Amino acid sequence: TRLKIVTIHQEPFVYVKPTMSDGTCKEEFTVNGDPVKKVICTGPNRHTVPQCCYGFCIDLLIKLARTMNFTYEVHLVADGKFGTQERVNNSNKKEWNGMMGELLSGQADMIVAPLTINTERAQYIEFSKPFKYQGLTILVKKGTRITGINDPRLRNPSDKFIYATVKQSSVDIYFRRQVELSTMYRHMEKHNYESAAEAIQAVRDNKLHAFIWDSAVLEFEASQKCDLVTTGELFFRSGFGIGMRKDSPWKQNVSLSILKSHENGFMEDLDKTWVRYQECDS
């Protein structure tokens, strides 16, 4: 009877850590001194095992479950991707990968993660109203001089300045579905990473010069690591929403909960707990 919730590792929305030797999760406290709420999330470490999950989206999940009175089980997307539609098995048959695919196949009943709301996905699933308003920006090593998405080193691609995004993500599609961005798309196609964490590390290690990704994630990362910065103003706006199959019995109630959370300070408090609370030190 409990909902199968699928999520993905993506700080500060979802942290994923090993359980202690006894199988439980380490007792930690937020910046406010409150216990950090932790849930067991099974997924690849390959090898699939129980792990500890917490963060902005986990607090949101707990709030939704309480408000809507439902039980759940959380697992991390098996292929580690957000989701794009592609031909499979060397055929012309198209299927969605990532969390999108799991939701459509029934492996998941609800996607609770920093999932971007876009038109392509909305053609196959239903989204709640946005639980977070953000956009796209660019992450670079402090010192790198880039104006933004219109910088010549991005518009006139060269092996001297490498940039990329994450494979099978909404950002990949944003560029793929725009002829005006064909040159850029062709460049990133040869450099895209499997996960945001790896791309961010690459920028830090000087192996990737620019990482194009969600501003909610990049601004947090850049604000916690003083060697990393973002290019400032977002070049596109998008929201994160809860994902459900079309004609789901949870759609209306999920959006009602999100509305209330935007109205009473709950969402704002999540930002003060998980996003803006301290200076760089990582």
UniProtKB/Swiss-Prot annotation:
Tissue-wise expression: Detected throughout the brain, in brain cortex, cerebellum, thalamus and olfactory bulb.
**Record's subcellular location:** Cell membrane; Postsynaptic cell membrane; Synaptic cell membrane; Postsynaptic density membrane
SS bonds (residue pairs): 25-52, 41-53, 226-280
Q: Which residues lie on this side of the membrane: Extracellular?
A: 145-282
User: According to the record, which residues are glycosylated?
Assistant: 45, 69, 89, 156, 253
Q: Where does glycine bind?
A: 114, 116, 121, 170, 214
Q: How is it modified after translation?
A: NMDA is probably regulated by C-terminal phosphorylation of an isoform of NR1 by PKC. Its phosphorylated state is influenced by the formation of the NMDAR-PPP2CB complex and the NMDAR channel activity.
Its subunit composition reads:
Heterotetramer; the NMDAR subunits are modular and harbor tiered domains that function in concert to regulate opening and closing of the cation-selective ion channel pore. Forms heterotetrameric channels composed of two GluN1/zeta subunits (GRIN1), and two identical GluN2/epsilon subunits (GRIN2A, GRIN2B, GRIN2C or GRIN2D) or GluN3 subunits (GRIN3A or GRIN3B) (in vitro). Can also form heterotetrameric channels that contain at least two GluN1 subunits and at least two different GluN2 subunits (or a combination of one GluN2 and one GluN3 subunits) (in vitro).
Purpose of the protein: Component of N-methyl-D-aspartate (NMDA) receptors (NMDARs) that function as heterotetrameric, ligand-gated cation channels with high calcium permeability and voltage-dependent block by Mg(2+). NMDARs participate in synaptic plasticity for learning and memory formation by contributing to the long-term potentiation (LTP). Channel activation requires binding of the neurotransmitter L-glutamate to the GluN2 subunit, glycine or D-serine binding to the GluN1 subunit, plus membrane depolarization to eliminate channel inhibition by Mg(2+).
Q: What's noted about domains in the record?
A: A hydrophobic region that gives rise to the prediction of a transmembrane span does not cross the membrane, but is part of a discontinuously helical region that dips into the membrane and is probably part of the pore and of the selectivity filter. The extracellular N-terminal domain (ATD) is a site of allosteric regulation to modulate overall receptor function.
Indicate the family of this protein.
Belongs to the glutamate-gated ion channel (TC 1.A.10.1) family. NR1/GRIN1 subfamily.
Q: What is this protein called?
A: Glutamate receptor ionotropic, NMDA 1
Q: Which part of the full protein does this chain span, and how long is the full protein? A: 396 to 800 of 938
